[PDB]
Design a protein around this ligand. Sequence first.
Ligand SMILES: Nc1ncnc2c1ncn2[C@H]1C[C@H](O)[C@@H](COP(=O)(O)O)O1
Length: 276
Amino acid sequence: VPLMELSGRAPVVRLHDIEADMAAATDAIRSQLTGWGFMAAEVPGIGERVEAMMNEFAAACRATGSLSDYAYDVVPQLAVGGTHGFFPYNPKEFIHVSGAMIGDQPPGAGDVLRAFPAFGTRAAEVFDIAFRLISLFGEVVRGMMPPGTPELDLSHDATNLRVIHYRREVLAHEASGIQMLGLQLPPSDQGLQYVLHDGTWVEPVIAGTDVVLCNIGRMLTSASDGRFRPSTHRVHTKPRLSSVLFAYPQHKARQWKMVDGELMSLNATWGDFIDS
Ligand SMILES: Nc1ncnc2c1ncn2[C@H]1C[C@H](O)[C@@H](COP(=O)(O)O)O1
């Protein structure tokens, strides 16, 4: 599977200059979505923050003073919404850090980030940078879409940072996101690959880099009435951590499509979109 070098080549977007640096990368990013399934940006300093987060997640996975004390089924959820907290092994381990969890929105939901406060501080930092980046990546996609295209309205409380441990050859079968957009963050190991428009595979060179990928999710495919296919991807590995931000709109908001240039408010909510 051909390797795709990105560090040195993707637009550069600086932590202290995100709004400006993303405006200046609009043209590049559009051409990526058009040329590849997906989009890419180099964010100098993101690598160090993501490696430190992931390393502290691993440590916490083996700690027993335990993450499973905050398994999804014992953490307060929101009435309507997705499910945040730790998902035990029996993606192998994995945690979902929502914006609600960061703000103790269901009071008691941020208790994992208080039990493991070093991973929590780093995960809250990574969430905030990744949400800013993903919302500006979505304004680029909206600008490639017909006039009248509404704002994506990505919700901070519904967005989740997934951090995975242990993800013997194929670690994923080909998959895409349910949600509007994903931000892939530089993983520990190489293996994540994307399908191109020609139906061939590339392996982004992203392990141990400052490169983030942005993924089209099936909600956006639906709202763009087919014009943007999901950024379908898989993971191959050779005898291990990873994290990705899944941006959702508010569950209770009405779905919408741009069909041949016309905006159509639908009956079903984005909530209903997930419940298949
Ligand atoms: N085992 C497992 N559980 C959950 N999500 C996974 C898993 N493997 C891959 N994914 C990812 C990839 C997609 O966005 C998304 C599907 O949402 P979903 O919540 O699955 O409808 O979750």
